[PDB]
């Protein structure tokens, strides 16, 4: 095996490559990197460093249009949710309705709802407290006995008063009543969906979602239909003229809790979608206290999409004047500049190293992160000259 001719391959700092491939007298070849790595018009066309104030929000909005068109057109199968989501938020052309419709086209359902529906009578098929039980419930309440009142309403299967009594007792038992009403008795998935929607707008999104982890049947459903689920929640958010971009806290819990579940189940694109909608910051800190899940980058940090998405997502936060930027992605920006070097784009390259310099010099000079970024930034900067 040491008496055998093997391939050879090496990268060079000069955007050249050397390789040798034994034949099916051995030749060594030296060719520029791009006869091997097909470059992307994506990184080349991107409007310099965003946030760099020589920036006009024009170039960017147009660049997203262009890119999104070319991408989907040339590759129909590519999921464009994140692309289009970031575009909306970039425009302030964003309403929960619009975001909802992006996740899931509801027009399919409008057809179904137009189909004529029976408005006729019906046989009694549910239960309801009689005068006796009704008196008992009142007396129970007159004595302050919530627990006994609820127990009686549930044992007679009257879920209406059960809900009412339950509301006097907190979100906890309220939720339990919802479950009993739905599941008391195919129609399997219907219950899951309704249950979740009602849980979210009560503050039990944590509870509701925690249930998935234990049930493999309902977790497969949740992860398989996450798009329509989130879309249902968003489209049911009460309209607010003065707060078009104000997520109601209960919906915020749901997005993060559900964005965690998806991470575990391996779906890190989904999760990131929810975090984006929820405006969760990019950092190293966990998204939730009781979880280890981290929102570090949109998609795998090495992907070109991630580089651009992450910087665009940052730009969006930047219109919030107090916002100072995501430190956690500075490494990715330097790596971005490095990628420009390899593609012989020294021009845009220095645009980044320069901007990043001021960006880093505005950091605690003694922090470990600061010191490393400075070194790594110097190395890339050196290479670009």
């Amino acid at each position: 095996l040491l008496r055998r001719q093997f391939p050879i391959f090496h990268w060079s700092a000069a955007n050249k490559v050397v390789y040798a491939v034994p034949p099916i007298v051995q030749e060594i070849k030296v060719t520029p990197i791009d006869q091997i790595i097909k470059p992307n018009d994506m990184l080349k066309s991107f409007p310099g460093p965003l946030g760099s104030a020589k920036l006009k929000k024009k170039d960017l909005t147009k660049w997203m249009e262009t890119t999104i068109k070319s991408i989907s057109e040339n590759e129909s199968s590519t999921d464009m949710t994140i692309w289009q989501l970031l575009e909306m938020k970039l425009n302030d052309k964003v309403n929960w309705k619009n975001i909802s419709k992006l996740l899931y086209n509801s027009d399919e359902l409008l057809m179904y709802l137009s189909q004529p529906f029976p408005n006729g009578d019906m046989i009694p098929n549910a239960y309801r407290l009689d005068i006796n039980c009704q008196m008992r419930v009142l007396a129970f309440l007159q004595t302050g006995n919530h627990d006994e009142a609820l127990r009686l309403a549930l044992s007679k299967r009257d879920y209406a008063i059960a809900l009412l009594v339950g509301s006097l007792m907190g979100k906890d038992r309220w939720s339990e009543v919802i479950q009993k009403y739905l599941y008391e008795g195919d129609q399997k998935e219907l219950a899951h969906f309704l249950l979740l929607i009602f849980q979210v707008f009560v503050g039990n999104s944590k509870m509701a979602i925690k249930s998935f982890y234990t049930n493999n049947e309902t977790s497969q459903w949740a992860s398989e239909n996450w798009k329509s689920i989130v879309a249902a929640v968003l489209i049911n958010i009460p309209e607010n003229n003065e707060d078009p971009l104000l997520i109601p806290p209960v919906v915020l819990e749901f997005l993060i809790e559900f964005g965690i579940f998806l991470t575990k189940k391996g779906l890190t694109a989904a999760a990131s979608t929810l975090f984006i909608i929820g405006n969760v910051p990019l950092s190293n800190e966990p998204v939730m206290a009781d979880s280890d899940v981290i929102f570090e980058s949109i998609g795998n940090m090495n992907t070109f999409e991630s580089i651009l998405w992450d910087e665009i997502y940052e730009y969006i936060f930047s219109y919030d004047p107090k916002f100072k930027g995501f430190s956690s992605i500075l490494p990715q920006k330097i790596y971005h500049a490095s990628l420009l070097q390899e593609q012989g784009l020294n021009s845009l390259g220095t645009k980044y190293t320069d901007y990043l310099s001021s960006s880093v010099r505005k950091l605690p000079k003694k922090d470990i992160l600061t010191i490393n970024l400075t070194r790594e930034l110097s190395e890339v900067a050196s290479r670009l000259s």
């Binding site: 095996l1 040491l2 008496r3 055998r4 001719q5 093997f6 391939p7 050879i8 391959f9 090496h10 990268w11 060079s12 700092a13 000069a14 955007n15 050249k16 490559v17 050397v18 390789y19 040798a20 491939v21 034994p22 099916i24 007298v25 051995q26 030749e27 060594i28 070849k29 030296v30 060719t31 006869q35 091997i36 790595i37 097909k38 391996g266 890190t268 694109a269 998609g299 795998n300 940090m301 090495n302 992907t303 999409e305 991630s306 490494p331 990715q332 330097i334 790596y335 490095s338 990628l339 070097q341 390899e342 003694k366 470990i368 010191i371 490393n372 070194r375 790594e376 190395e379 890339v380």
Partner: protein
Amino acid sequence: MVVIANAHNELIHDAVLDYYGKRLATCSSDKTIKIFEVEGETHKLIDTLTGHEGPVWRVDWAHPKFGTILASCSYDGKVLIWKEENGRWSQIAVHAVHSASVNSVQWAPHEYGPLLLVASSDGKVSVVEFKENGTTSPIIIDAHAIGVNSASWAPATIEEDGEHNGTKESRKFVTGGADNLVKIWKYNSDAQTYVLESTLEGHSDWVRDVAWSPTVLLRSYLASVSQDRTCIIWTQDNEQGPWKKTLLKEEKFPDVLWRASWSLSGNVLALSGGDNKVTLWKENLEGKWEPAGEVHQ
């Protein structure tokens, strides 16, 4: 494109461009190194370097700020160091400490100065400086049982220095041995040598190469490559945390894997295999490795 036919009459084991991509260095079972000038689409032989007494397995260029300097290793158990001055080549140093083949040699990050990491079939690994203005001295450690096939520097980084509430640098490198293991090493000022940080088990046969990604990102990436016909990608979220292990792809490769090399930006991985093909790989959105090009000529 530049083509070099018949650089040697015997097997060619390595060929490496210098930093500016204007010199190529090649080495053979014929016991010699050759230095080619590459200017544009043209090339010419500048010098043949003789000195080794067995096949020369690998060569590595030092960072240009140290000048124009090459290192070579050989079956004969020696590491030779060569310098170009006023156009002409010559030998400037010899590292001869190992009692069996020296399988890899690699210059450290330029932050440490001209420093070499050397790996041998005698089971040991050595680290020695290069100086023309002073006296060198090797550090020699027992690394792997049956022998060491490869050793690679981790990038220069600064870490928190607790004992003194300040900053110190952490020097690490990774080794791959004929014992099927991968090991991380970290210098320790108290022990005055490199000590074992971690032992990564995963391969079922000799490890032929290990390459520590130069990625500027926080997470750490290692690619190990084995005769078990697999490539393992090792990650580490935190300088002080565990190593995650992942198969590059789920199924064995056709033949044995020989070399692994990361692009400068640290995202692309190029594998050299026994099927006589070089495969490029990189991560998709979900972090799964997928083809990024090929060279099968």
